[PDB]
Design a protein around this ligand. Structure first.
Ligand SMILES: [Ca+2]
Ligand SMILES: [Ca+2]
Ligand SMILES: [Ca+2]
Ligand SMILES: [Ca+2]
Ligand SMILES: [Zn+2]
Length: 316
């Protein structure tokens, strides 16, 4: 909508208070004009029609329980935008400040969230498996990252290319969580997964096998479920990324860690410069090796560590 930029205040899914950029014109809308061509958050009203209605509020205070998923979808989209801009010099998901749209209250008791090719979409969860999913900064960044991938590598969402697609979203979802520096970790979805169980998460990058996911190519899923295991076989790439950053020993192979920032630079360059729609694990290794070579030189520690990380997870 056309209006004036304003600043509201509210509470997120975890009950934390934060300021949000809004737009005033009769109502206060969840429309942040300070980032690119804007960040727009919508109410899906428990339906599956999209996007729903642009979120409107009478007083620019967002403290109702119904408000919480919207506050976080809006705020964390902002944080993700800032990460890509400040860290990778990327302006929104298309690199040309494309408007970012999210809908919350998607369907009834919906235990998921997704990027649909045009926007992010968040369920409220059923209160057992999930609470509203936009409450997870890694979840929001994971979904927005699918948009980045769509506009760059275009990794097909099936088999190995789909597993890379998924891992890329977990990698940058995590790097965004670290960027915001609020209880950061190498787990995925811990803030919104199973309100009844402490200490768990949907996936682990540090130890994928903790939640049933492979951490070595020899243990890769070869069947047809989950689009050829896109959220399963991502564990192999997540483990490699974790190793590149943090180092360690894994199946008797030692990796010298080079830190998160360098992990981010290498994978961002791989994604935007080398990967293709049909890239497999082997091609990701090469893309990452070449990226690290461009950035730090072929004889560098960074290149050596990428090679050791892929060695450790059995990807040549
Ligand atoms: Ca209000
Ligand atoms: Ca966390
Ligand atoms: Ca996390
Ligand atoms: Ca839990
Ligand atoms: Zn995903």
């Amino acid at each position: 909508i056309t209006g004036t930029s304003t600043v509201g205040v509210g509470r997120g899914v975890l009950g934390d208070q934060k300021n949000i950029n809004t737009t005033y014109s009769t109502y206060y809308y969840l429309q942040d004009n300070t980032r690119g061509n804007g960040i727009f958050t919508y109410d899906a009203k428990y339906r599956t029609t999209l996007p729903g209605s642009l979120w409107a509020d009478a007083d620019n205070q967002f403290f109702a329980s119904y408000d919480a998923p919207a506050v976080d979808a809006h705020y964390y989209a902002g944080v993700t935008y800032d990460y890509y801009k400040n860290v990778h010099n990327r302006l929104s998901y298309d690199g040309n400040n494309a408007a970012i749209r999210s809908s919350v209250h998607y369907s009834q008791g919906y235990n998921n969230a997704f990027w649909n090719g045009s926007q992010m979409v968040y369920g409220d969860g059923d209160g057992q498996t999930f609470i509203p999913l936009s409450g997870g900064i890694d979840v929001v960044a994971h979904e927005l990252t699918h948009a980045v991938t769509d506009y760059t590598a275009g990794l097909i969402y099936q088999n190995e290319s789909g597993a890379i697609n998924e891992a890329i979203s977990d990698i940058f979802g995590t790097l965004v969580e670290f960027y915001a520096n609020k209880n950061p970790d190498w787990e995925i979805g811990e803030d919104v997964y199973t309100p009844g169980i402490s200490g768990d998460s949907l996936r682990s990058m540090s130890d994928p096998a903790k939640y049933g996911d492979p951490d070595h190519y020899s243990k890769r899923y070869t069947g047809t479920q989950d689009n050829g295991g896109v959220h399963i076989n991502s564990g192999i790439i997540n483990k490699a990324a974790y190793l590149i950053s943090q180092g360690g020993t894994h199946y008797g192979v030692s990796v010298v860690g080079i830190g998160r920032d360098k992990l981010g630079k290498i994978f961002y360059r791989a994604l935007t410069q080398y990967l293709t729609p049909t890239s497999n694990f082997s091609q990701l290794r090469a893309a990452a090796v070449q990226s690290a070579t461009d950035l730090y030189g072929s004889t560098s520690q960074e290149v050596a560590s990428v090679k050791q990380a892929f060695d450790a997870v059995g990807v040549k």
